[PDB]
Structure formats: C-alpha cells, structure tokens
Amino acid sequence: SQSIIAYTMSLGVENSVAYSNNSIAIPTNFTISVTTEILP
Amino acid sequence: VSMTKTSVDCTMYICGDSTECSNLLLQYGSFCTQLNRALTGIAVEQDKNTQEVFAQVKQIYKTPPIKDFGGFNFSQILPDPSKPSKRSFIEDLLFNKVTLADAGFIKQYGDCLGDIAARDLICAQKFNGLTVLPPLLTDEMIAQYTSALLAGTITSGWTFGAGAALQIPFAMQMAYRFNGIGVTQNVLYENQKLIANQFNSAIGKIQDSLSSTASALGKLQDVVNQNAQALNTLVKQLSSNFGAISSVLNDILSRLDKVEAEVQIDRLITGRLQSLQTYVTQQLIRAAEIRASANLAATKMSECVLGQSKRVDFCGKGYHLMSFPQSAPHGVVFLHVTY
Amino acid sequence: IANQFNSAIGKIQDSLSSTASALGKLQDVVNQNAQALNTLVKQLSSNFGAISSVLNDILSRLDKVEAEVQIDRLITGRLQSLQTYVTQQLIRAAEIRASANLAATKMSECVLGQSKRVDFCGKGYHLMSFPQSAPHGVVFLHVTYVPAQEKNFTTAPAICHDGKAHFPREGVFVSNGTHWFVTQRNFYEPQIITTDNTFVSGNCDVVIGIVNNTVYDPLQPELDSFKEELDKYFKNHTSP
Amino acid sequence: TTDNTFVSGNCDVVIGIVNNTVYDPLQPELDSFKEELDKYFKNHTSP
Ligand SMILES: *[C@@H]1O[C@H](CO)[C@@H](O[C@@H]2O[C@H](CO)[C@@H](O[C@H]3O[C@H](CO)[C@@H](O)[C@H](O)[C@@H]3O)[C@H](O)[C@H]2NC(C)=O)[C@H](O)[C@H]1NC(C)=O
Ligand SMILES: *[C@@H]1O[C@H](CO)[C@@H](O[C@@H]2O[C@H](CO)[C@@H](O[C@H]3O[C@H](CO)[C@@H](O)[C@H](O)[C@@H]3O)[C@H](O)[C@H]2NC(C)=O)[C@H](O)[C@H]1NC(C)=O
Ligand SMILES: *[C@@H]1O[C@H](CO)[C@@H](O[C@@H]2O[C@H](CO)[C@@H](O[C@H]3O[C@H](CO)[C@@H](O)[C@H](O)[C@@H]3O)[C@H](O)[C@H]2NC(C)=O)[C@H](O)[C@H]1NC(C)=O
Ligand SMILES: *[C@@H]1O[C@H](CO[C@@H]2O[C@@H](C)[C@@H](O)[C@@H](O)[C@@H]2O)[C@@H](O[C@@H]2O[C@H](CO)[C@@H](O)[C@H](O)[C@H]2NC(C)=O)[C@H](O)[C@H]1NC(C)=O
Ligand SMILES: *[C@@H]1O[C@H](CO)[C@@H](O[C@@H]2O[C@H](CO)[C@@H](O)[C@H](O)[C@H]2NC(C)=O)[C@H](O)[C@H]1NC(C)=O
Ligand SMILES: *[C@@H]1O[C@H](CO)[C@@H](O[C@@H]2O[C@H](CO)[C@@H](O)[C@H](O)[C@H]2NC(C)=O)[C@H](O)[C@H]1NC(C)=O
Ligand SMILES: *[C@@H]1O[C@H](CO)[C@@H](O)[C@H](O)[C@H]1NC(C)=O
Ligand SMILES: *[C@@H]1O[C@H](CO)[C@@H](O)[C@H](O)[C@H]1NC(C)=O
Ligand SMILES: *[C@@H]1O[C@H](CO)[C@@H](O)[C@H](O)[C@H]1NC(C)=O
C-alpha cells in the first residue's frame, strides 16, 4: 500500500494576520530557545 | 539569486550517436561523470540559493482585505488578483525587463521540427546534449513567498522574523522605525500625511523608472546573457577540427576505416573534452559569484525586510526604515525605504 | 529563564544523540574531499589511448622509442586529471574560505558580542551564543528570546489629556477595553500612564487616531497631601 | 530644562561651555503654591 506520490509542494501553512488600524498583539510570555548552527 | 540550471550529456556532446566514438571516450575514465557531477552540484545549489533567499518564512501571510495602512499605498507592491500568475504590479514590470533564454519547460521536439528550429539556438543546444532544467520553485512560488514576506512586513513589522507575527497599526510600526533611526516618534504622527505622500510618490517614481528605461535590471540580464553565451560557445566548439580531417564525426567514420578513424576521432574527443572542462570550470567559478550574491540577498532579506538595519548604506543610501522584496527573473529586487 | 535554557540545552543533547543528518554540512565536506581523492585514484586505471594503463607493462613490452608514444599519452591524461583535481580543490577551497569567514564573523558578533542583526545569530532576538568544536568545523548554540503567548489589545499612537498630546518615552499604549496603560513593546507589563512614562508634543488636532485618557502627574498627590495637611493646620490654628 | 539635561562637574573643565539658564519645572509648581500660601496666611491674619 506504500507508493511514490507526486505533488505541488506546500510553501507553508496559510495565515491571515489579524491587522487593524487600532489593534496590537503583545507577548505576555517568552520562550528561551537554543538552536544549533553548523559551519565548515 | 540564481542562474540557469544546465546539464550536459558528455557522450551526446563529445560522440553524438556514434558507438565507435563512445568506445574511445570510455578510455578517458571518470571525466564525463566528473562533468555531470559538477553540473549537478551547481544545479542543486541554484534551488538552495533561491530557498535561502525567499523561503525565510515557514508561514504564508495574507494581507487584509481592508487597506487602512494609515495612508501608505502598498497596492503597487502587493499582489494583483486580476492576472493569472499572481504577481504584484512592480513584479510584472521587473518580469518584462529580463528576457529569458529557455526555462526548461516542455520543448517537445516538434518545435525543433521546422524553420523555427533553424532560427533559434535552443534546438541546436538541445540536439548537442546541452539541456536547460527548470528551477524547483516556479515564479508563482517566488511571488507567493515574496507576498508573504511583504504582507508580514506591512501587518506585523519585524515581529514575524523573530517569532509569531504580532499585528501592529502601520503608522505605529513607522513610529517604532523612526525611533530606530533616532528620530522621535511624534515627528512621524505630526507629519503622517506628508510621510505617506512622500512614500506613495517615491513608489510612483520606481514604476516610472522601471517602465521607461531598458537598462535598470542590467545585473540580471548580464547573468542570463553569460549563461546563454557559454552554451553558444560550447555549441560552436563542435565546428572546430582540433587537427582532425573533418569536424563532423560521421564524416570521419564514413571516410576512414577502424584503424585510421580512431586517430582522428581521438582528436575530436580530446578537443571536445577540453571544451567541456573549460565550460564547467567557467560555470563552477560563476556559480561561486552567484552564490556570493545569493548569500548577500538572503542577508538583505533577513536584515532589511525581517528587521530594521543600523548598518550604514547596507539597506539603501539613507537611514534605513524598512524594505520590500520583489521577485525578478533569476533574482530579487529590494525596494529600500529610507529617511 | 534558567529552567528554559537548561531544558533547551537538554533538547540539543537529545537531538544530536538521536538523528544522523544534523551534521550534514560537515559530513558533506568530508565526502567531497574523499570522493575527489577516490576519483583521482580511480582515474589512474584509465588507458587514455595507450596500450595499457599500467606504466610498467608499457616498459616491459616496448623498446625505448615505441614506449615514449604510449607513456606520453598516460602523462597527458594524468596531468589533465591533476589539473582537474587541483582546479576543483581551489574552487572548493573558496567555498570553505567563505564559510570560515562567516564562522569567524559569527564568532565575533554572536560569541564575543550580542547582535542586533535579525536571523544572523539564530531565529529570534539574540541573547548570546556558545561555540562548540566539530570535525573540520564549528557549531554555534545560539540562544534567543522568542515571544510566545500574545494577547490582543486596543491601541493608540498618542493620549490626549489637556489639549496637549502625549507619546510613550519607551513602549506603547494599550487598552484591555476599559482602561489605558503603557507597556514595553516586547513584553506585556502594563503601567499607569504618567508624566514619567510619556512626553508631550503639539496638541490633539494633528495626530490621526489619538484617544482621550487621563495622564497621572505624580507631583500632584505630593502637593495635595501637603494641601490637606495645611488646611487642617489652618482650621486647628483658628481654634485657640 | 532639568528634564532634558543631566549634570556633571562644573564650568572650568569643559572646553567651549556657554552660560545659559536651565529651567526647573518643579520651581513654578511650588512658587504658585508659595504666593497662594502667603495669601492663605493673609486671609487668616484678616479677622
Ligand atoms: C482593565 O485593567 C484594570 C486594571 O487591572 C482593571 O480594573 C481593576 O478591576 C479590579 C476588579 O476586577 C478592581 O479590583 C479591586 O476592586 C475593589 C476596589 O474597591 C476591591 O474590593 C478589590 O479587592 C480590588 O482591589 C480594580 O480596582 C480595578 N482598577 C482600576 C484602576 O479601576 C479592569 O477590570 C480591566 N478590564 C478588563 C476588561 O479586563
Ligand atoms: C476628547 O476630549 C475633548 C474635551 O472634552 C472633546 O472636545 C470637545 O468636543 C465637543 C464635541 O465635538 C465640542 O463641543 C462643542 O463644539 C462646537 C462648538 O465649538 C458645537 O458644534 C457643539 O455643539 C459644542 O458646543 C467641544 O468644544 C470640544 N472641546 C474642546 C476643548 O475641544 C473631544 O471631542 C474628545 N474626543 C474624543 C474622541 O473623545
Ligand atoms: C559664565 O558665568 C560665570 C558666572 O557669572 C562667569 O564667571 C565670573 O566671571 C567674572 C568676570 O570674568 C569674574 O569676575 C571677578 O573675578 C575676580 C575675583 O574672583 C576679580 O579680578 C574681578 O574684578 C571680578 O570680581 C568672576 O570671578 C567669575 N565668577 C565665577 C563664579 O567664576 C563667567 O565669566 C561667564 N563666562 C562667559 C564666557 O559668559
Ligand atoms: C486577536 O483578534 C483576532 C480577530 O479579532 C477578534 O475576532 C473575534 C474572535 C472577536 O473576539 C472580535 O471581537 C475580535 O475583534 C483573532 O482572530 C481569529 O482567530 C481565530 C483562531 O484563533 C479564527 O478562528 C478567526 O477566524 C480569527 N478572526 C480573524 C478576523 O482573523 C485572534 O485569535 C486574536 N488573537 C489572540 C492571541 O487571541
Ligand atoms: C510562561 O510560560 C512558561 C512555560 O515556558 C510557563 O511555565 C510553566 O507553568 C505551568 C503552570 O502554569 C507548569 O505546568 C510548567 O511546568 C511550567 N514550565 C516551566 C518551564 O516552568 C509559565 O507559567 C508562563 N508564565 C506566565 C506568566 O504565563
Ligand atoms: C493607491 O495607488 C493606486 C495606483 O496609483 C491608485 O489607483 C488609481 O485610482 C484612481 C481613482 O480611483 C483611478 O482612476 C486609477 O485608474 C487608479 N490607477 C490604478 C493603476 O489602479 C489608488 O486609488 C490608490 N489608493 C488609495 C486608497 O488612494
Ligand atoms: C479605523 O477604521 C474604521 C473603518 O474605516 C474607521 O471608522 C476608524 O475611524 C478608524 N480608526 C482610526 C483611529 O482612524
Ligand atoms: C494645633 O496647632 C498648634 C500651633 O498653633 C500646634 O502646636 C498643635 O500641636 C496643633 N494640634 C494639632 C492636633 O494639630
Ligand atoms: C573657536 O574659534 C574662534 C576663532 O574662530 C576662537 O575665538 C574661539 O575661542 C574658539 N572656541 C573654542 C571653544 O574653541
């Protein structure tokens, strides 16, 4: 039941930003994230 | 950002449809696999360059249907729905400046069956084993990523670079930007209609410039022209004798027997293999310039679009407020906005 | 903040211990030099049109002057094989210089400093980075503040209080819907709108979208406490 | 003003310093309370 599929690739998940002339989003909290970057 | 992907079939270039030439070409060992491998390396690097430049958002932002950006008129750099390939008005002006020379799309052999085939070099390149290949991202997908970078910028400022997109009113985003250049935020609000008019007028001059002059996209047409010229030069080396009795492989094989022919075919193999190793050296060195330009373009995408840069003259000449990316054939255009 | 950093360094152990592909940028550089030397060795086995690839078989079977024509083809084909290998290695070495100059720039701007450059020192607002050695390379563990749990608020570019228009000195105005506050832009921490949080310029006619709210002046209760003190003391001093 | 500026040291060390007044916004806010306070004693002296 496994097979090779072929598809148009998704660029990313879709998102309409909730913009308005008088609305702001402000973070009530933060995440400290550590991310690895590797260079020759 | 990128250059045309090419792949060259070493046997079809060197020995075009002769087996008794192919049996000599085998005596040179790995060189045809080195040439294929090197060109495949360059070809994959062109998609990587385009991914590093445009795919900096993993999320596809939509602009709101209302356009209350405080008087700033992005309608000339946001998408136009009314045309099938979903690019913005300035991206259509950019797309018309750079005349491509193939993109790999479906050159289905019956085009190369006529007077059309005689007037163009694309059929001659194809028949001599030189093939252009298509980019992984279509110009639709570059326009979508560019639309998402721009819609993120006008609805959420720098915040979609660092984390989740946080909405902010556009005239308040410009206030954060004015404080960023050391100008106090009341200087925006007390002049907001003038700042919007000067921005709207400056975007107007970008259209008038791009619509009038033939030369504005010269850096991209130079890259297209160098790729096309290196393929045309490689095709024309198939007319050199290299000291053989004829340049045409089948003339040697019809006019000489198996012993004296192999002395002549070996010269054509030597000269043609030297012509491919020249072309692939030029292309590997070129690819390093196109990469260096792509890594700069990705660095301007990160520091001028996804942020505001304190780096003097990095994001256009002036104090940097913000930048808008636009797609172009094999490139990116940044519209840098400066106080 | 310490627990989150310690937990995120925990995910670095687990990810590097679990997956094979994470060091692909370094393993690919080792694979290219290994493949280029393997190719240069395999290429010795070619004839280049000589009667053998093995130089000693030519010299075992041919005399001093018929051998030269066979040996010279092997010379020509092997010399072309080195000129190819060395050209490939010079072009690659330019990609390794560019990577080493980027790594030196990231050492200077992400380890020896803190970078205002977006996405240069990892995805987020850069706090600091830690270098780690790797075979033929460097790993940077970039530490970033990422804003996490947002709330919407109503907002205004200015507050109007006394015909005068007020702007934040640092931060942004917000309302929960009933009250107005000023907050630092990248972390919700609301404060009463005061003459210490704000500055005045112009009047409320010019700012598009200004809103009316009171502005507290913390000198007033220090003068009003000092006023009711005085009024009671005058009432007392009318009594004797 | 004392809100737009900060103090450090005295007029001798800074090459090219100039004399001008520096307004203090605390001063009229207490001098208005002073002439009113003198009026309040004047009312209390009146009967
Ligand atoms: C918007 O934010 C305001 C400040 O956080 C908030 O106002 C505050 O509301 C609480 C009740 O939820 C009041 O709490 C006090 O209520 C009485 C006062 O006599 C006491 O019995 C309680 O112990 C407590 O101290 C606050 O006094 C009030 N603050 C002000 C300045 O009025 C609003 O409720 C928030 N609005 C929304 C829509 O969330
Ligand atoms: C913010 O607060 C202001 C002060 O309370 C308030 O200003 C006042 O607005 C009213 C209504 O526009 C004006 O009313 C008078 O206007 C003319 C005469 O000039 C007449 O047509 C009206 O009948 C009426 O007499 C006040 O003159 C005006 N006062 C001042 C000092 O400007 C704003 O309206 C408030 N704005 C918001 C959005 O809350
Ligand atoms: C800036 O303001 C300063 C204060 O007004 C002023 O300093 C004063 O300058 C006068 C004139 O040079 C000096 O005059 C006295 O000097 C000696 C005694 O100390 C005598 O020989 C003189 O007859 C006279 O009495 C003051 O000594 C001096 N006072 C102080 C506190 O330094 C500056 O001159 C002003 N400078 C400018 C350029 O405006
Ligand atoms: C911030 O607000 C937006 C949109 O505004 C609100 O829309 C209603 C939900 C209502 O509360 C109104 O009074 C507000 O003005 C929120 O966007 C919605 O998000 C949900 C998924 O979370 C989605 O189903 C809706 O279709 C979205 N609506 C729009 C117009 O985009 C958003 O969720 C709020 N942000 C946060 C952090 O809660
Ligand atoms: C901010 O987010 C952190 C998580 O990063 C929250 O911490 C967690 O709090 C819950 C209880 O509320 C616990 O179950 C988790 O174990 C906590 N995790 C850690 C790492 O401590 C924190 O509560 C949030 N703070 C605010 C003010 O919302
Ligand atoms: C934003 O800019 C566009 C293009 O400059 C404006 O579009 C023009 O609008 C007038 C008035 O409706 C039309 O007569 C023109 O034909 C439009 N031109 C184009 C190219 O569409 C648009 O009006 C501006 N938007 C706002 C809100 O001012
Ligand atoms: C926001 O948009 C609405 C609808 O156009 C408008 O009525 C309102 O006045 C605008 N607010 C500001 C602050 O301009
Ligand atoms: C009332 O005023 C007198 C001075 O006239 C003062 O000595 C006394 O302590 C005051 N009493 C009170 C209760 O303030
Ligand atoms: C500035 O230059 C002028 C001469 O043009 C000189 O008189 C004056 O003393 C100088 N002032 C300072 C503070 O150097």
Side-chain angles (χ1 to χ4, degrees), chain A residues 28-31, chain C residues 3-4 7 148-149 187:
Chain A
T28 68
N29 208 358
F30 53 73
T31 44
Chain C
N3 287 346
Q4 288 192 45
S7 183
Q149 292 175 302
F187 185 82

Side-chain angles (χ1 to χ4, degrees), chain B residues 30 161 167 176 185 277 303, chain C residues 43 80 117 123 152 168 172:
Chain B
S30 66
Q167 74 281 357
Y176 289 89
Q185 54 195 359
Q277 288 179 1
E303 296 179 44
Chain C
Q43 191 66 358
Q80 184 171 4
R117 303 177 60 182
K123 184 173 173 65
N152 298 332
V172 64

Side-chain angles (χ1 to χ4, degrees), chain C residues 217 219-220 223-224 226-227 230 234 237-238, chain D residues 3 25-26 29-30 33 36-37 40-41 44:
Chain C
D217 177 3
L219 183 145
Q220 294 294 79
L223 265 63
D224 297 335
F226 175 84
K227 183 62 62 168
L230 178 71
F234 280 132
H237 200 186
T238 60
Chain D
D3 293 351
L26 177 60
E29 282 282 34
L30 70 80
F33 269 48
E36 186 209 1
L37 173 65
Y40 280 19
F41 280 105
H44 189 198

Side-chain angles (χ1 to χ4, degrees), chain B residues 250-299:
Chain B
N250 297 337
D251 294 353
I252 293 163
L253 296 174
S254 52
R255 302 172 58 181
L256 299 182
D257 90 44
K258 191 60 164 290
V259 183
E260 282 72 48
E262 290 187 340
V263 180
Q264 302 296 323
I265 300 292
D266 178 62
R267 300 185 144 274
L268 297 187
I269 291 168
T270 299
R272 297 183 177 173
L273 184 56
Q274 184 169 24
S275 303
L276 283 171
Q277 288 179 1
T278 301
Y279 171 78
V280 175
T281 301
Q282 302 301 320
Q283 285 288 95
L284 277 172
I285 293 165
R286 179 174 297 88
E289 159 48 38
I290 295 294
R291 179 171 54 90
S293 185
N295 292 340
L296 180 67
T299 301

Side-chain angles (χ1 to χ4, degrees), chain B residues 27-28 30-31 34 37 161-162 166-167 172 176 179 184-186 189 266 277 284 291 299 302-303 311, chain C residues 39 43 47-49 73 80-81 84 88 95 117 123-125 150 152 155 157 167-168 172 185 199 201:
Chain B
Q27 305 184 16
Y28 286 76
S30 66
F31 286 139
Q34 287 198 315
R37 193 148 62 214
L166 305 176
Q167 74 281 357
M172 285 177 51
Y176 289 89
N179 300 307
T184 317
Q185 54 195 359
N186 73 277
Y189 300 121
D266 178 62
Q277 288 179 1
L284 277 172
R291 179 171 54 90
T299 301
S302 295
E303 296 179 44
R311 298 173 63 189
Chain C
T39 304
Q43 191 66 358
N47 288 314
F48 306 112
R73 279 162 98 34
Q80 184 171 4
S81 304
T84 304
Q88 296 292 325
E95 182 175 354
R117 303 177 60 182
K123 184 173 173 65
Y125 303 100
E150 78 292 344
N152 298 332
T155 188
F167 308 88
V172 64
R185 336 140 142 18
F199 77 89
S201 187

Side-chain angles (χ1 to χ4, degrees), chain B residues 5-35:
Chain B
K5 297 178 176 177
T6 68
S7 54
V8 177
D9 184 22
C10 190
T11 296
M12 190 178 294
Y13 181 82
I14 297 178
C15 282
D17 71 66
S18 162
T19 294
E20 64 271 88
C21 185
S22 304
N23 288 346
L24 290 167
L25 178 59
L26 260 60
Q27 305 184 16
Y28 286 76
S30 66
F31 286 139
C32 288
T33 289
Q34 287 198 315
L35 291 162

